[PDB]
Amino acid sequence: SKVTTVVATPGQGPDRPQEVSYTDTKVIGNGSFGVVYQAKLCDSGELVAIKKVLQDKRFKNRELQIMRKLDHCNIVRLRYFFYSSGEKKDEVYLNLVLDYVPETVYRVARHYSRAKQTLPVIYVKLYMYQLFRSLAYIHSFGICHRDIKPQNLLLDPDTAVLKLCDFGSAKQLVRGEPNVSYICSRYYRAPELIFGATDYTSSIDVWSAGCVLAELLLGQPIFPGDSGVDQLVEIIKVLGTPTREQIREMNPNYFKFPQIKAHPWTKVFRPRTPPEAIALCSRLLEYTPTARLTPLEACAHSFFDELRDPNVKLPNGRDTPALFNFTTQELSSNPPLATILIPPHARI
């Protein structure tokens, strides 16, 4: 039975390369970036995922740079990295070895969707709350993810622990230094990007989070456009034509549209949708980027009260994961929020 030994650098520790041995290799994902494998660490039998990407020798890998910095319970941890050869000989591949997690928010929601059901709202709150924590943490470093969607939210369904993954589009955003407008997956892409903004902020991640939340409530994407222009048309059918001031706030440059009225929020969603879910969604899916809640404010929204109840359990009987162990860094955008975020029973 085949074992592979490589010399790998620890993700967060000091740059002393070390021998790492793994076995039980299988393909579990792929994309334009390259390929993702599952493997088992001989060391501790622990399962990991190995993401293998092509390395341009002109420039450093920004994915690697960003992932080395990250240490959070709701973010897939970079354990090691190493270099190898691969398919296109005389080329160098970067291998990222990450926490392995067996499900995605997308897969779980599709199980329900295929059965013509929607996910119980307790799971919607657990997932969305963990998404907003991981966004609060990355945004506190100025890092924007730029590809928030259900497929990038890994899940352990026994524990309900969620971890953000795929930092392939992520970037440190610097005020006055321009960024590409054509990013994010289309269904989740903020309107200021559709309008060609290059000066956008971390708030585009919040718009994407709002789209994930509405998909969970609806059982299908809320804005399924076939192109960028048709993406705006989908957005408009629900939100109405953006006003002049809204366009200005989105892109101080970028027309006359068919004047179309906002669809009432309550009838976008199924009859019995909790009002608090709808009110949250409306404060995420705003045209004016500055009007959207921050990640930390989203966590403190009433929609998530049930998670702060001392007697709350997962449906399967087990205790909820870590939800209240906020750090100084996490709270930094708005320290007084801690009084809400950390309930009395979680301080002790």
Ligand SMILES: CCN(CC)S(=O)(=O)c1ccc2c(c1)/C(=C1/Nc3ccccc3/C1=N\O)C(=O)N2
């Ligand atoms: C989805 C995000 N990626 C692109 C495939 S990724 O950055 O390469 C990436 C990175 C670390 C990762 C993963 C994916 C990952 C994944 N576990 C899974 C289990 C079932 C189906 C898909 C995945 C999956 N991925 O589809 C995992 O356990 N650690």
